[PDB]
Design a protein around this ligand. Structure first.
Ligand code: GDP
Ligand code: MG
Ligand code: MG
Length: 167
C-alpha cells in the first residue's frame, strides 16, 4: 500500500486539528486541547489511484525547538497552516518552513502553504497576494481553506500527495 506520512504544522489556534478532523470525519469541530498529538490513517484516491495517508496532528503551540525537529525528521510531506484572520500566525509560519529545509538538508521537501479560516473573511488580516507571494518564493502550492468545507480539505490532502510524488 503506498503510505504517505504527512505532518500538519502551524501556530496554536490556526485550525490544524479542525482541518485534519474535517478530512477524516467530514465534520467541523468547535475546540480541542492544543497539547495533544494524534495520528490518523485514512485512505484517499488522488487522480483515481488509491493512497493511504498517515496524518500527524501536532501539539504546535510554541513547542521546544528539538520537539519540532523530531516531527520534521520523521515526516515525509508537510502542511504549513496559518490563519488568515491572525497575521501573527502568518509571521510565525516563516521560521517553521526554514527549519524544515535545514533539518531535512539532504532532501527536496514537499510542502504546501495554507491560509485557513477563509469563512471569516470580514476579519481578514493577511491578503491572498501575501500568502501567494511567500509560496512563490518557496516554490510550493498555496491554498486558502475553511475547515468548514469538506471539498476544500479534500483538495488540500490530495495536493500534498501529488507534491510527495513529484519531489
Ligand atoms: N471559523 C472557523 N473556525 C475555525 C476554522 N478552523 C478552525 N477553526 C476554529 O478555531 C479554533 C482552533 O482550531 P484548532 O483546529 O483547534 O487549532 P490548532 O490549535 O491549530 O489545532 C477552534 O475553535 C476551531 O473550531 C475555520 O476554517 N473557520
Ligand atoms: Mg490542534
Ligand atoms: Mg488521541
Amino acid at each position: 500500500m503506498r503510505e504517505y506520512k504527512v505532518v500538519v504544522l502551524g501556530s496554536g489556534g490556526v485550525g490544524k486539528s479542525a482541518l485534519t478532523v474535517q478530512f477524516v470525519t467530514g465534520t467541523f469541530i468547535e475546540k480541542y486541547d492544543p497539547t495533544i498529538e494524534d495520528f490518523y490513517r485514512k485512505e484517499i484516491e488522488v487522480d483515481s489511484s488509491p493512497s493511504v495517508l498517515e496524518i500527524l496532528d501536532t501539539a504546535g503551540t510554541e513547542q521546544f525547538a528539538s520537539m519540532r525537529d523530531l516531527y520534521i525528521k520523521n515526516g515525509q510531506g508537510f502542511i504549513l497552516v496559518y490563519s488568515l484572520v491572525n497575521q501573527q500566525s502568518f509571521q510565525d509560519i516563516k521560521p517553521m518552513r526554514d527549519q524544515i529545509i535545514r533539518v531535512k538538508r539532504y532532501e527536496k521537501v514537499p510542502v504546501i502553504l495554507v491560509g485557513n479560516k477563509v469563512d471569516l473573511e470580514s476579519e481578514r488580516e493577511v491578503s491572498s497576494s501575501e500568502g501567494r507571494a511567500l509560496a512563490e518564493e518557496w516554490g510550493c502550492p498555496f491554498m486558502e481553506t475553511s475547515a468548514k468545507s469538506k471539498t476544500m480539505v479534500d483538495e488540500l490532502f490530495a495536493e500534498i500527495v501529488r507534491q510527495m510524488n513529484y519531489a
